[PDB]
Write a protein that binds this ligand. Structure first.
Ligand SMILES: CC(C)(C)[C@H](NC(=O)C(F)(F)F)C(=O)N1C[C@H]2[C@@H]([C@H]1C(=O)N[C@H](C=N)C[C@@H]1CCNC1=O)C2(C)C
Ligand SMILES: CC(C)(C)[C@H](NC(=O)C(F)(F)F)C(=O)N1C[C@H]2[C@@H]([C@H]1C(=O)N[C@H](C=N)C[C@@H]1CCNC1=O)C2(C)C
Lengths: 299, 303
């Protein structure tokens, strides 16, 4: 049972490089539009305190250098949508997949295609944390890298990368340019709210451990949903809803372990610790697999 | 804070096809005008219990092989067996063929796996070849013929093709010349993974990654010789280091100023006493599936 990303090829064909002045990052080329973070228009000094509408009105189409591989694409229009710049180009991307833009919920997962200078570097799976950060792997020049899910050859883009917080976690926007979380695209110290653990995901992963032959953490105790949620909240876990209980249905049916019985297992894990033992090779309780991720990999 | 990162899979996605004989369907790799796939595609389920591959291949002709890119059939114009892989010559050169090499990897080396079903890629993840020549993969029915690979400057180095799952849940397969990693055979008969060991060179790479990020409490004031370290390491079920291992740690040793043998002595102390209550890179366990290249790959912005 591995952290598994979606195949990245459909997104690789959309990555380009965008340069304004001496600022270079990545863009997403779909049909005849390139989407990228608006701070590409900032000088280093601008980034410390940008007025973006004031900065953008001072730019012309020819200030944007867009490169697809070695070929330059001519920008013939530009507009700003929240924190995303949309560059209209005179060329349509023949590799444009069927796609949608979606805004994801905390706890949901997606694949990231990390890119530099318009070229793909690596692919990995992330979760939107409850505090709306992501624990990514991004370096200088990674901005405009995107996160996505793939469903029957349709790519749902959900994340575009903008920044790294001082704790090392990452922040960005949806493809409409709206940040996840209380962050702004200004170079200034920013903290996130206190994070919490994605309870429904921990339960899905505990089911993954049972599907793969590991059961040491199970017990005969029992819990109600409300009594479990009281303990979960005490340990900085997110509440478990009836909707979550229902989504876990297929995993409980496959394993014959009632959802509330797995809740009692997790309650014991939280109250006693793991005693130096491991679950699926992990010393900590993993919360970045959704129920759907577990089903997709185990079935 | 240091996670597994797969290579972008697009160059390999463009090479995946499906291969069917009878009702047995698996994945194949289409490069130029040849499709490579596991030879047990020619077996019925009953054949797999005790196959005579040479005799089974005698009874097959080109017209018995259904090769499809999606729903599009590729006409087979020749077939041959090379160890445990079948090579089907087709009448169309794949226009998506990347620059590529076939390589046989060492234990400890990592690669990306593109898990595929019915020729359709489903997911991508990183794997290490264990010292017992298994991989801790994630594979379901129909996954055979999925490949593992590394990329270096637009050249895809294919190193693994998937064939089978062992009773402990780990996986075994071949290089792209059809030679198994490890003592395994492509027959549905009782087989077992041997005892595994910890990949020392990768643990050292992980300790260097910790040092790069300022996590260096475990740096001691001692050193060791390679031979003394190798003999102690084996007592803790750690792999001995080769001369090649020492050299592939060279770049990380230069970056940090920590000599390889000094880091070996630091690791020895962890094995004999260490951790206590402390963590390294936020982990109480020593990670052994990051190579020195993987550390450098993720700390640089390669490609
Ligand atoms: C890291 C840092 C001190 C620099 C800064 N962060 C904060 O100022 C914060 F703390 F508010 F987040 C920061 O990220 N930026 C400052 C400036 C852009 C952004 C930025 O350089 N983005 C990079 C895009 N190519 C990706 C980064 C690079 C390192 N790893 C990443 O992911 C804008 C917010 C306009
Ligand atoms: C696990 C099973 C008991 C079925 C058997 N294993 C052993 O006989 C062993 F234990 F000896 F290894 C086994 O894998 N096979 C039996 C038969 C082929 C192979 C096989 O079905 N390969 C699948 C390719 N599509 C991938 C498998 C499916 C489940 N997960 C996988 O990865 C051959 C060895 C010729």
């Amino acid at each position: 049972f591995r952290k598994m990303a979606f195949p990245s090829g459909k997104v690789e064909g959309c990555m380009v490089q965008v340069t304004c002045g001496t600022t270079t990052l990545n863009g997403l080329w779909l049909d005849d539009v390139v989407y990228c973070p608006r701070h590409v228009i900032c000088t280093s000094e601008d980034m410390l305190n940008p007025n973006y509408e004031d900065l953008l009105i001072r730019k012309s189409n020819h200030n944007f250098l867009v490169q697809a591989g070695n070929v330059q694409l001519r920008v013939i229009g530009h507009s700003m949508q929240n924190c995303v710049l949309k560059l209209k180009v005179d060329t349509a991307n023949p590799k444009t997949p069927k796609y949608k833009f979606v805004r994801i919920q905390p706890g949901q997962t997606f694949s990231v295609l990390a890119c530099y200078n318009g070229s793909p570097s690596g692919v990995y799976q992330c979760a939107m944390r409850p505090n709306f950060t992501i624990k990514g792997s991004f370096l200088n020049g990674s901005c405009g890298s995107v996160g996505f899910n793939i469903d029957y050859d349709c790519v749902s883009f959900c994340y575009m990368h903008h920044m790294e917080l001082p704790t090392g976690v990452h922040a960005g926007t949806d493809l409409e340019g709206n940040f996840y979380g209380p962050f702004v695209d200004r170079q200034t110290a920013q903290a996130a709210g206190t994070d919490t653990t994605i309870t429904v995901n921990v339960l899905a992963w505990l089911y993954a451990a049972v599907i793969n032959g590991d059961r040491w953490f199970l017990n005969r105790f029992t819990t109600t949903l409300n009594d479990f949620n009281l303990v979960a909240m005490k340990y900085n876990y997110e509440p478990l809803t009836q909707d979550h209980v229902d989504i876990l249905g297929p995993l409980s049916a496959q394993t014959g372990i009632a959802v509330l019985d797995m809740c009692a297992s997790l309650k014991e894990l939280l109250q006693n610790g793991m005693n130096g033992r491991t679950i699926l090779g992990s010393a900590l309780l993993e919360d970045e697999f959704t129920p759907f991720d577990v089903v997709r990999q185990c079935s």
